[PDB]
Subunit: 118 residues, 4 copies
């Protein structure tokens, strides 16, 4: 038998139970997004913690992050999206970074995963 | 006359007012448990503190600890229970350890005492 | 003109606005108490801070301190009360000390002043 | 494009988005106040932070500061107002300083800006 470690083991949602992500594994999750006609975006924030309220159901703190520049309307290659992750990690090297994807027909997001840790 | 010291004197419930526990005194409290047909178990946790809530009677925080592997269904000797307290204190040497006992006819616990301090 | 200093200037109630208290000034406030037939006592506590509650009038925290040994029933000289302030300040040298006085006809206190600071 | 910095960038209200204020720019904002017949004043405080309350609209903490000596009733030159900012910054060199101006016909304030930072 074995015991799961309960001390200082935080998780970060989707694809967080697999071995660490490498290049040529991130470039394939963007090709699958572009051939379905979706729009990428970027985000960053220093601390990923959440809070609550005394007696209000459905309320939590810490769900909004800062948008890098603007959504990329009309991108067709996976190069301009891979060259913008380096400018962001050289100006704010002490924060987290996330990648999103939008859909306008149904008005909902489609992807979210982390690519950098402080 | 004499004065009880009120500064930095925490207590830990049952058998916490007697001189410190030694071996050949822990092995006798497990013999008395096995001849009444009860099931041992183990637990651990870093901090033993409790909290409250504004206006909810009968609610407190800090009453659940983590379970080591599983309850021992069918133990008959006090050696296998005394050899499992050493594996636990070499993997997590900075936590508390407690020993419990179970009854399945009345569905309640019967014993609880501490055997290690950080 | 002059300005009262608003930074780090705590006060401690009665007789706290006069020059610092000396001996041959504490012994005279006990003679006045004994000739009116009152009973002395002692107290101590580490921190003199108070708190409140959200919506409960007339409730505050931090009004109870610890009693030294027992009220002195039958004291008639100001020597046994002046020899008990030295045993207390040699066992707990990092706490405050207060002196009280009781009345058993109207069931109220009569005086309270501080004689030691950490 | 460019990105506004969201980390450690506090603001201080009016005239806080301009280049830093210099002399001969502070003396010209007091001449405009005196020729409209208003009364100057001074204030100081260590920390400019605000708080809230659970469910009370229109309530905030941290809006009152300490008054230096008294309002100047009858000032006619901008010298006595510029010589009182040096006595205040030599007695409390670790606090903020703010300048006000009153009106008695309509009973409201008219000006507010910072002139010193710790």
């Amino acid at each position: 038998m074995q015991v799961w470690n309960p001390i200082d083991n935080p998780k970060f949602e989707t694809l967080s139970y697999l071995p660490p992500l490498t290049d040529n594994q991130i470039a394939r999750e963007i090709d699958y997004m572009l051939r379905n006609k979706w729009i990428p975006c970027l985000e960053f924030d220093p601390s990923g913690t959440i809070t609550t309220l005394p007696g209000q159901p459905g309320y939590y703190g810490g769900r909004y992050w800062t948008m890098w520049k603007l959504p990329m309307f009309g991108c067709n290659n996976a190069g301009y999206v891979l060259r913008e992750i380096e400018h962001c990690k050289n100006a704010y090297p002490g924060c987290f970074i996330r990648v999103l994807g939008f859909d306008n027909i149904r008005q909902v997001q489609c992807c979210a995963f982390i690519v950098h840790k402080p």
